[PDB]
């Protein structure tokens, strides 16, 4: 009735979304085969936001998996919940991109874009009132960022009123594993700013800084980095599936976050994460949850909001919890610390309370924050673009795909507007 069509692209996008569906299916009591085996009644009431219905009482997700190489479809099909996906939703080309934005955008990713848009137009018109889409990708590869922005351009030229949302994993600066990634990421941010409603920023550097510092894990892997992205991929959409004392969908947080239509890059974070020895030493009350949304170490971007000004702030609270204690603690963070808040917006906080917590938990909390300390995420990409671009470094890999050097020069200055557009609100 308020359906969400999932899109997900690349090896990064197909390995984030495979764990996210293991989070949702347990949250709604769905087995590895698909059948419903829950206990409550609220688990089967708004399941149609994310799940279709097959025959025999078996639920199949609305997920369309996209890739340019054929080797990340076998990883997902034969994983833990790989048998819940309809096999027509998998899209794969028989030759990759190989860390290249141009092969993603023009050469290889344009013969594959017209077969996914025959899939998504079959899943988007099969919704009673489609709320919007989603994306999950990375700005470092070829098919995550090249064709992953070709798709968004075709969506927002075809369904403009609907919500387009992105969970971007923008490239990590100082744990980096590709020389040719700043060409991919700089060329991809003009396509984000004109064709997305919201966009979240995730760095894999700052997902490691949780798993070493906060959780005190011995050997984390990418299975515990996808485990945290799905924690905040479900808290944004938890008031759409479970009732509350105060609701907020994906649109009401978008109405209340962006003041100007070019300023939609945010910073998620999830509160009740506890290390294994400190698990028994903590109790679950309300100020235990607002001390870890707003802690600057907790954030899922590797940029610090003490260097900038919070334009607006969100919060999503889950559990059965008191409306006075919710409300009095967000006034509390506004008043002790009032140089991290913009003047011209007097209240900077939106709050929402959902009743049904994550399974086995009593209370929970989620965050979405908009900053002028996120123009420090693009200037560390600009400094490593024009340091490399001014000597025409890896340029033969891109210009021989059918490009031009002026197409680079505009993506210098279209992203350099967002540096100086955001800059005038710190003044």
């Amino acid at each position: 009735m308020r359906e969400i069509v999932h899109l997900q692209a690349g090896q990064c996008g197909n390995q984030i979304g495979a764990k996210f569906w293991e989070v949702i299916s347990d949250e709604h009591g769905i087995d590895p085969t698909g059948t419903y085996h829950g206990d409550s009644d609220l688990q089967l009431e708004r399941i149609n936001v994310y799940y279709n219905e097959a025959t025999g009482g078996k639920y199949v997700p609305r997920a369309v998996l996209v890739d340019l190489e054929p080797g990340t479809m076998d990883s997902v099909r034969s994983g833990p919940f790989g048998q819940i996906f309809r096999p027509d939703n998998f899209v794969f080309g028989q030759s990759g991109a190989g860390n290249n934005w141009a092969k993603g955008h023009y050469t290889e990713g344009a013969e594959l874009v017209d077969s996914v848009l025959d899939v998504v137009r079959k899943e988007a018109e099969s919704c009673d009132c489609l709320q919007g889409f989603q994306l999950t990708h990375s700005l470092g590869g070829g098919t995550g960022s090249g064709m992953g922005t070709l798709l968004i351009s075709k969506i927002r030229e075809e369904y403009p009123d609907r919500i387009m949302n992105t969970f971007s994993v923008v490239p990590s600066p100082k744990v980096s594993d590709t020389v040719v990634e700043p060409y991919n990421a700089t060329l991809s941010v003009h396509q984000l700013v004109e064709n997305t409603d919201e966009t979240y920023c995730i760095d894999n550097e700052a997902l490691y800084d949780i798993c070493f510092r906060t959780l005190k894990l011995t050997t984390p892997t990418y299975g515990d980095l996808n485990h945290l992205v799905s924690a905040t991929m479900s808290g944004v959409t938890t008031c759409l599936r479970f009732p509350g004392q105060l609701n907020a969908d994906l649109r009401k947080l978008a109405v209340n976050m962006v003041p100007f239509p070019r300023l939609h890059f945010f910073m998620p974070g999830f509160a009740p994460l506890t290390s294994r020895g400190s698990q028994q030493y903590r109790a679950l009350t309300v100020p235990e949850l607002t001390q870890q949304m707003f802690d600057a170490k907790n954030m899922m971007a590797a940029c610090d909001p003490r260097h900038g000004r919070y334009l607006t702030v969100a919060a999503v609270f889950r559990g059965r919890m008191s409306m006075k204690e919710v409300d009095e603690q967000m006034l509390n963070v506004q008043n002790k610390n009032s140089s991290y808040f913009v003047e011209w917006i007097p209240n900077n906080v939106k709050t929402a309370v959902c009743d049904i917590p994550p399974r086995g938990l009593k209370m929970s909390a989620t965050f979405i924050g908009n900053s002028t300390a996120i123009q420090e995420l693009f200037k560390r990409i600009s400094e490593q673009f024009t340091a490399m671009f001014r000597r025409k470094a890896f340029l033969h890999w891109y210009t021989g795909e059918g490009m031009d050097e002026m197409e680079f020069t505009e993506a210098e200055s279209n992203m350099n507007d967002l540096v100086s557009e955001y800059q005038q609100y710190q003044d």
Binding site: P70, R77, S78, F92
Partner: peptide, 14 residues
Amino acid sequence: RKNCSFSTPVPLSL
């Protein structure tokens, strides 16, 4: 060892 039985296309299989 690599096991690419799921991912090979139906044109090109054994």
